[PDB]
Amino acid sequence: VKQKAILAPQQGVTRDLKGQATALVVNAQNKVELRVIKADRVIGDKWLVTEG
Amino acid sequence: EDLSNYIVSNIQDPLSRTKGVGDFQVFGSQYSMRIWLDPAKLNSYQLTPG
Question: Where is the protein situated, by its record's location annotation (chain B) (predicted)?
């Protein structure tokens, strides 16, 4: 069992060109930017992001 | 590579169907699904590239 895992929703993360699935994270100053995702598995309807 | 991909994918033929564009020459290429084989694991699983 992986401790302190983080799950993302299904259609919240989408892939652009050259693969490289990304998700639109929101900054503390209400700005927005897309970050890369190291998604390796899906549990139910939630992607398991390892880092990013 | 992704810039050359975007140029040859999204803007290339709309550029080439315009008037007077007789030829083009693009630096780079499009995406292609490259499959890099490893010869050690090919030797491991008794497989050939064919």
Answer: Cell inner membrane
Give the minimum alpha-carbon distance from A45 to chain B in angstroms, rounded to a whole number.
Answer: 28
Strand, coil or helix: what is B6?
Answer: helix
Q: Could you tell me whether strands A46-49 and A6-9 are parallel, antiparallel, or unpaired per DSSP bridges?
A: antiparallel
Residues near B34 by Cβ (< 8 Å), separated by ≥ 6?
Answer: none
Query: What's this structure's resolution in Å?
Result: 3.2
Method underlying the structure:
cryo-EM
Joined together, the tokens standing for residue A44 give 């139910």
CA distance B19 to chain A (A): 30
Phi first, then psi: give them for residue A16, nearest 5 degrees: -90, -160
How many residues make up chain B in this entry?
A: 50
Partners of residue B30 in chain A, C-beta under 8 Å? none
Residue B1: its chain A contacts at CB < 8 A? 18
The percent of chain A in helix, strand and coil, each rounded to the nearest 5, is: 0, 60, 40
